[PDB]
Design an enzyme around this catalytic site. Structure first.
Site, short mmCIF file in Angstrom:
data_model
loop_
_atom_site.label_atom_id
_atom_site.label_comp_id
_atom_site.label_asym_id
_atom_site.label_seq_id
_atom_site.Cartn_x
_atom_site.Cartn_y
_atom_site.Cartn_z
N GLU A 5 -4.87 3.85 -10.75
CA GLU A 5 -5.73 2.69 -10.54
C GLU A 5 -6.87 2.62 -11.55
O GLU A 5 -7.11 1.58 -12.16
CB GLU A 5 -6.30 2.71 -9.13
CG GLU A 5 -5.26 2.56 -8.04
CD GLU A 5 -5.90 2.53 -6.65
OE1 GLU A 5 -6.30 1.44 -6.21
OE2 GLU A 5 -6.00 3.60 -6.01
N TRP B 200 -9.12 6.31 -0.69
CA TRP B 200 -9.45 7.06 -1.90
C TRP B 200 -8.46 6.72 -3.01
O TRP B 200 -7.37 6.22 -2.73
CB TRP B 200 -9.46 8.55 -1.62
CG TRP B 200 -8.17 9.08 -1.08
CD1 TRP B 200 -7.01 9.33 -1.78
CD2 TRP B 200 -7.91 9.45 0.27
NE1 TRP B 200 -6.05 9.83 -0.93
CE2 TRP B 200 -6.57 9.91 0.33
CE3 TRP B 200 -8.68 9.43 1.45
CZ2 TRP B 200 -5.99 10.35 1.52
CZ3 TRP B 200 -8.09 9.87 2.63
CH2 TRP B 200 -6.77 10.32 2.65
N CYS C 23 0.82 -1.21 0.00
CA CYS C 23 0.00 0.00 0.00
C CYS C 23 0.86 1.27 0.00
O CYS C 23 1.63 1.52 0.94
CB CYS C 23 -0.96 0.02 1.21
SG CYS C 23 -1.95 1.54 1.32
C1 HEM Z 1 -6.39 6.56 1.82
C2 HEM Z 1 -5.83 6.47 0.61
C3 HEM Z 1 -5.21 5.17 0.04
C4 HEM Z 1 -4.51 5.11 -1.09
C5 HEM Z 1 -4.20 6.31 -2.01
C6 HEM Z 1 -4.10 3.75 -1.31
C7 HEM Z 1 -3.37 3.29 -2.37
C8 HEM Z 1 -3.18 1.97 -2.71
C9 HEM Z 1 -2.78 1.46 -4.02
C10 HEM Z 1 -2.53 2.32 -5.27
C11 HEM Z 1 -2.68 0.13 -3.94
C12 HEM Z 1 -2.31 -0.80 -5.11
C13 HEM Z 1 -3.50 -1.74 -5.28
C14 HEM Z 1 -3.75 -2.08 -6.73
O1 HEM Z 1 -2.99 -1.57 -7.61
O2 HEM Z 1 -4.71 -2.86 -6.98
C15 HEM Z 1 -3.02 -0.26 -2.58
C16 HEM Z 1 -3.03 -1.52 -2.05
C17 HEM Z 1 -3.41 -1.88 -0.77
N1 HEM Z 1 -3.96 -1.05 0.21
FE1 HEM Z 1 -3.90 1.01 0.18
N2 HEM Z 1 -4.57 2.98 -0.26
C18 HEM Z 1 -5.27 3.82 0.59
C19 HEM Z 1 -5.90 3.40 1.73
C20 HEM Z 1 -5.89 2.15 2.30
C21 HEM Z 1 -6.61 1.73 3.50
C22 HEM Z 1 -7.55 2.67 4.30
C23 HEM Z 1 -6.32 0.43 3.71
C24 HEM Z 1 -6.78 -0.52 4.85
C25 HEM Z 1 -7.41 -0.10 5.94
C26 HEM Z 1 -5.40 0.00 2.67
C27 HEM Z 1 -4.83 -1.25 2.53
C28 HEM Z 1 -4.26 -1.76 1.38
C29 HEM Z 1 -3.88 -3.14 1.20
C30 HEM Z 1 -4.01 -4.28 2.25
C31 HEM Z 1 -3.31 -3.21 -0.23
C32 HEM Z 1 -2.74 -4.41 -1.01
C33 HEM Z 1 -3.55 -5.68 -0.81
C34 HEM Z 1 -2.58 -6.80 -1.03
O3 HEM Z 1 -1.87 -7.21 -0.06
O4 HEM Z 1 -2.51 -7.27 -2.19
N3 HEM Z 1 -5.19 1.07 1.85
N4 HEM Z 1 -3.30 0.89 -1.87
C1 LIG Z 2 -3.51 -9.91 -5.13
C2 LIG Z 2 -4.11 -9.09 -4.02
C3 LIG Z 2 -4.94 -7.97 -4.60
C4 LIG Z 2 -5.39 -8.06 -5.91
C5 LIG Z 2 -6.16 -7.03 -6.44
C6 LIG Z 2 -6.65 -7.12 -7.87
N1 LIG Z 2 -5.48 -7.27 -8.75
C7 LIG Z 2 -5.77 -8.24 -9.81
C8 LIG Z 2 -6.48 -5.93 -5.66
C9 LIG Z 2 -6.03 -5.86 -4.35
O1 LIG Z 2 -6.35 -4.77 -3.60
C10 LIG Z 2 -6.29 -3.51 -4.25
C11 LIG Z 2 -6.51 -2.34 -3.32
C12 LIG Z 2 -6.62 -2.49 -1.93
C13 LIG Z 2 -6.83 -1.37 -1.12
C14 LIG Z 2 -6.92 -0.10 -1.70
C15 LIG Z 2 -7.12 1.04 -0.93
C16 LIG Z 2 -7.20 2.28 -1.57
C17 LIG Z 2 -7.06 2.37 -2.96
N2 LIG Z 2 -7.12 3.56 -3.61
N3 LIG Z 2 -6.87 1.24 -3.67
C18 LIG Z 2 -6.79 0.03 -3.08
C19 LIG Z 2 -6.59 -1.08 -3.89
C20 LIG Z 2 -5.25 -6.88 -3.81
#
Ligand code: HEM
Ligand SMILES: CCc1cc(CNC)cc(OCc2ccc3ccc(N)nc3c2)c1
Ligand code: HEM
Ligand SMILES: CCc1cc(CNC)cc(OCc2ccc3ccc(N)nc3c2)c1
Ligand SMILES: C[C@H](O)[C@H](O)[C@H]1CNc2nc(N)[nH]c(=O)c2N1
Ligand SMILES: C[C@H](O)[C@H](O)[C@H]1CNc2nc(N)[nH]c(=O)c2N1
Ligand SMILES: [Zn+2]
Lengths: 411, 407
Positions: B283, B278, B106
């Site tokens: 994305e 947000w 993240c």
């Molecule tokens: C507040 C603004 C936030 C922004 C701008 C942000 C941004 C991002 C981005 C760009 C990704 C890449 C995911 C993708 O490309 O599909 C991501 C993944 C992730 N975000 Fe954040 N996020 C935010 C908030 C949060 C919050 C509030 C949580 C949890 C309470 C969180 C937990 C996660 C987790 C767990 C992943 C990856 C999931 C995995 O392990 O594959 N995010 N985030």
């Molecule tokens: C592999 C784990 C995974 C896969 C995928 C789909 N990709 C094919 C999405 C996943 O989460 C994607 C994610 C999680 C939290 C977010 C919070 C804020 C934000 N702007 N984007 C998020 C985007 C995680």
């Protein structure tokens, strides 16, 4: 053990068995991944297994495993080791080794071409002048009037580590960098330290933005010597843009031949500390990294300024916009001048074809995602969606510390 | 054992000591790096509880206090007796915030401590889940001024009574496999859009149909609920320069709200824990719009720009990609809906990394996911070495319910 990789765009799944032949370490453990870390005197006790393993591989590849030829060579190498504490590679072995080092280079997206490497044996070289001559011939051959050809020139292997052959240049052709008293930089900032050394060694610097650096060549552990590459051998391309006429007036050019000269080639435990190699450019190497890295020529602002972009807030994506045009211009220029270059779309596409072929015929293809994915437009290239396994096979190209940090000066 | 990470753009070097508190595994070994791989009893539980309570009571400057010891033995008793235990509200909030702090993929974690935690552990039915989720959505959206939130439903007990949100995000557009062979709407959701209809949904078979919620409570069969449209904030997508852009008919939703992950705190498992923040602009514009296996509008936009699409070397895909991402950002910003561009977000993250190394001894980070899917090397994170390891509390991945539901 079997390992599966998946392409999330096409759902193709490949199975890796080759990773079982992996010798070296990654830097990773069960508890930490060092996947994004850039950088993570040999006795006979360890040399003969390394020699045996290589020769087993070699004689497999030529379908002569367990043959009398195979056994005699082992015996021969064996005696030569405990007699001399090292050994010599046959020409065929050297060629095989160099090609496979390239094939095994997990950070190289260009490996579809690995089998068509021109190997120049320079193991009979003894002096810096000899090195200069060999390198000139490499540059001329590789450049081929713009129709580039992959080549590697291999200088003598390490013996006691006190007689190393080294090319002190990071690439055979690179531009000088000069730090001005006001803190600004003229030329390529990546090369400021090396430029200073060259100047210290007696080089007379033209002090311009695109001065081709002199070769600094070390033979048999002696102090390195300066040589100027003949300019007629250095192919360069003036950068212009196909629609923006003001782009030519930015005064940019680049050299056509990417030739990495500071790596170490390992083959059957033997270390070739000077082994310059060259292919051809992927456009983004120049257009994205060399021109637009903040720590390099850093031309994004000037280009953006000339494009009249909204440069006030980043969310205008003026940086992104200028980056694309610059990379368009680099491609346009090389193609217009009939100098071999490949765009990142074509290159990554070819690599996926290569990788799939390698899984089928070889049981794997070690690949470093962090490096294979291009520095712009990542997810719209097919390698972004490709899962990859990274492991280390030999023969290999290895990093070595910069020679000026380790060299014992003779004087 | 005390690891260094280098930024090659700035030469800044940070020492990481935090990784030494890592517990879970990476998928990697000394022989093979799996860094780019998408998806690698009573006695098990108490050390897990203890480890968590240790970091909690340490965090409130009360390590080795009477209250610490009391809480420890209290929890230990409840485990011995009930074969599980319940988190105090304070611990729940801590665990959730720190699960986000520990999310190595993240980029937005500079916001981690400003998370609104909604305790939904008294929920018992799908209708209750729907209510909690509507409230979440309304609170988080906040008329475009988005606020980070998580809603936590009851923890797993014996796996027979799992709470699950079957949607991957609270808000996503439907996808239908057309007769002529193509795909209308979002291809990533074709199977889920099918299952919804396969359980009674009635699709307005349009291009951007907001999917219904499929909520599973206490291990029961999941139920369909439609989010009130007035709760679903959407942004019409136009370009600040190309007036034909609006004709493409594109919009996206304001609230990214991931709802299929599993939250682990002190050994307890929360299988339904939708959270939201947000968007980063890429994305939507890079991945949602231009991915081949998604809306894949590149060729359409390239056309109207009248770009040379003859040869890949004209970088028409690249040129279009930038304009599209300009439009997304421009649209959201115009409509006062929170969004961050990839430059500012990656800049935020470096500062956050700096902060975490300085106050915590490190920051687990997955370079493969932190680096944006466009313009990679002109963002600071490209040049930033990162160490990836797994800390608890965590968000984990779990199987899709429709592969497991004891129906
Ligand atoms: C507040 C603004 C936030 C922004 C701008 C942000 C941004 C991002 C981005 C760009 C990704 C890449 C995911 C993708 O490309 O599909 C991501 C993944 C992730 N975000 Fe954040 N996020 C935010 C908030 C949060 C919050 C509030 C949580 C949890 C309470 C969180 C937990 C996660 C987790 C767990 C992943 C990856 C999931 C995995 O392990 O594959 N995010 N985030
Ligand atoms: C592999 C784990 C995974 C896969 C995928 C789909 N990709 C094919 C999405 C996943 O989460 C994607 C994610 C999680 C939290 C977010 C919070 C804020 C934000 N702007 N984007 C998020 C985007 C995680
Ligand atoms: C022929 C066309 C080739 C292309 C298009 C190509 C492309 C690339 C690119 C883009 C990189 C990343 C470079 C960077 O971003 O700094 C790379 C890395 C690398 N290439 Fe290739 N390459 C080619 C030929 C070769 C040849 C001939 C060799 C050796 C015989 C080679 C060996 C390597 C090695 C060892 C690396 C890793 C550098 C490192 O470890 O830091 N490549 N290649
Ligand atoms: C870290 C060692 C290193 C650094 C750098 C520059 N980073 C700022 C480049 C390195 O190798 C870069 C390389 C190697 C082989 C190539 C072959 C062909 C080609 N077109 N480009 C190459 C590019 C290695
Ligand atoms: C195979 C590869 O790991 C996969 O395409 C990853 C790469 N990096 C990513 N990074 C982010 N932020 N989101 C993603 O979905 C992915 N996908
Ligand atoms: C820290 C990080 O590993 C470093 O910036 C890497 C990222 N990926 C790269 N990829 C390529 N092709 N070339 C590079 O120099 C780098 N640099
Ligand atoms: Zn790893």
């Amino acid at each position: 053990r079997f390992l599966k990789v998946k392409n999330w765009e096409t759902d193709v799944v490949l199975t890796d068995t080759l990773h079982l032949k992996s010798t070296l370490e990654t830097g990773c453990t069960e508890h930490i991944c060092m996947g994004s870390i850039m950088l993570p005197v040999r006795t006979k006790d360890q040399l003969f297994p390394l020699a045996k393993e290589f020769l087993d591989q070699y004689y497999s590849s030529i379908k002569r495993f367990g043959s009398k030829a195979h056994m005699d060579r082992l015996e021969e190498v064996n005696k030569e080791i405990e007699s001399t504490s090292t050994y010599q590679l046959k020409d065929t072995e050297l060629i095989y080794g160099a090609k496979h080092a390239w094939r095994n280079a997990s950070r190289c997206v260009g490996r579809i071409q690995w089998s068509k490497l021109q190997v120049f044996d320079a193991r009979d070289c003894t002096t810096a002048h000899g090195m200069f001559n060999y390198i000139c011939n490499h540059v001329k051959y590789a450049t081929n009037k713009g129709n580039l050809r992959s080549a590697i020139t291999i200088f003598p292997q390490r013996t006691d580590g006190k007689h190393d052959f080294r090319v002190w240049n990071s690439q055979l052709i690179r531009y000088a960098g000069y730090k001005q008293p006001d803190g600004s930089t003229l030329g390529d900032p990546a090369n400021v330290q090396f430029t200073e050394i060259c100047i210290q060694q007696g080089w007379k610097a033209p002090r311009g933005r695109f001065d081709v650096l002199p070769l600094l060549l070390q033979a048999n552990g002696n102090d390195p010597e300066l040589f100027q590459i003949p300019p007629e051998l250095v192919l360069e391309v003036p950068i212009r843009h196909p629609k923006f006429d003001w782009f030519k007036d930015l005064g940019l050019k680049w050299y056509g031949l990417p030739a990495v000269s500071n790596m170490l080639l390992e083959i059957g435990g033997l270390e070739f500390s000077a082994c310059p190699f060259s292919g051809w450019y992927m456009g983004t190497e120049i257009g994205v990294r060399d021109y637009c890295d903040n720590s390099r020529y850093n031309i994004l602002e000037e280009v953006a300024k000339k494009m009249d972009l909204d440069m006030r807030k980043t969310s205008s994506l003026w940086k992104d916009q200028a980056l694309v045009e610059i990379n368009i211009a680099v491609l346009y220029s090389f193609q217009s001048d009939k100098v071999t270059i490949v765009d990142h779309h074509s290159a990554t596409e070819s690599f996926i074809k290569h990788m799939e072929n390698e899984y089928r015929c070889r049981g794997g293809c070690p690949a470093d995602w962090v490096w294979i994915v291009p520095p712009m437009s990542g997810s719209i290239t097919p390698v972004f969606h490709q899962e990859m396994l990274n492991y280390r096979l030999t023969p290999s190209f290895e990093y070595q510390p910069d020679p000026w940090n380790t060299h014992v000066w003779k004087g």
